[PDB]
Write a protein that binds this ligand. Structure first.
Ligand code: 03K
Length: 289
């Protein structure tokens, strides 16, 4: 770590602090994340998982019981970009380009059987060129998803798939498609889709919009560990009310990304072929750094 000069603190992650820093040997500006043998091997497998829409893991440094991850640095995250674009909204062509690139990132990781498990706007990073990249891919399998961060901050439930909330222990790549669907809806409407503040509030917000799931829409739901027959039965809402002014192609794609049954939920690869992307382009965002 004597090879890095900290520039500034860029945030507090789930596992530890994130700094912007300079590598003295190469002159490289990086993001430094300050975090057991099983974690070392898993994190080392991530150094190989390279794609233009995945924040590059440059190095893993393990010294004096501390783990440091050295990543490619990007100048802004999607959460801050969405807040900065609150008054006007992010233009639809830019939302579509970001969704398309995020799906490419997911299709790549999922093809290598690597799940993210904790996608959220905070871990989507953007640059001046119009790229968007997924950060922290693979970290949840290495260290777990805790209730609170190292600073006691509450880990957000807003993008959590219903099978995780219902106690499925062996979840699939579909959990990342659900989280990305929630993010897509939030970019369009400028409001979080399901801003739960407890596990039951998160689940009941999903049920109030998509309908309480049953054996018809989700075979096996009633046998899930945390399912309770006493859950209230709410009716499903039309997407036309949920995500206006999203067009019919976008609403149909979103509906497939939010299917209750993870087996029915669209894959990233199939989502890339959706008619919503017929006119996709790569616009340049308005970024003042
Ligand atoms: N708006 C701003 O000043 C702003 C917001 C976010 C960032 C940011 O998190 N950057 C990062 C993080 C990373 C890898 C995952 C560790 N690479 N790059 C930097 C600057």
């Amino acid at each position: 770590m004597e090879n890095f000069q900290k520039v500034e603190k860029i945030g507090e992650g789930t596992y530890g602090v994130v700094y912007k820093a300079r590598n003295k040997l190469t002159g490289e500006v990086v993001a430094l994340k300050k975090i057991p043998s099983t974690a070392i091997r898993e994190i080392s497998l991530l150094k190989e998982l390279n794609h233009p829409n995945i924040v590059k893991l440059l190095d893993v440094i393990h010294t004096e019981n501390k783990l440091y991850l050295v990543f490619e640095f990007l100048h802004q995250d999607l959460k801050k970009f969405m807040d900065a674009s609150a008054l006007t909204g992010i233009p639809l062509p830019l939302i579509k380009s970001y969704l398309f690139q995020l799906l490419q990132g997911l299709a790549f990781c999922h093809s290598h059987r690597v799940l993210h498990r904790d996608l959220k706007p905070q871990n989507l990073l953007i640059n001046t060129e119009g790229a968007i990249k997924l950060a922290d891919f693979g970290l949840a399998r290495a260290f777990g998803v805790p209730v609170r961060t190292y600073t006691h901050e509450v880990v957000t439930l807003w993008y959590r798939a219903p099978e995780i909330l219902l106690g499925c222990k062996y979840y699939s790549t579909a959990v990342d498609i659900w989280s990305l669907g929630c993010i897509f809806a939030e970019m369009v409407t400028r409001r979080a889709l399901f801003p739960g503040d407890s596990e039951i509030d998160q689940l009941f917000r999903i049920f109030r919009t998509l309908g309480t799931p049953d054996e018809v829409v989700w075979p096996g739901v009633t046998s899930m560990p945390d399912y309770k027959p006493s859950f209230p039965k709410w009716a499903r809402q039309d997407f036309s009310k949920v995500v206006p002014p999203l067009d019919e192609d976008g609403r149909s794609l979103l509906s497939q990304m939010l299917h209750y049954d993870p087996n029915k939920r669209i894959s990233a690869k199939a989502a890339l072929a959706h008619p919503f992307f017929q006119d996709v382009t790569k616009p340049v965002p308005h970024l003042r750094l």
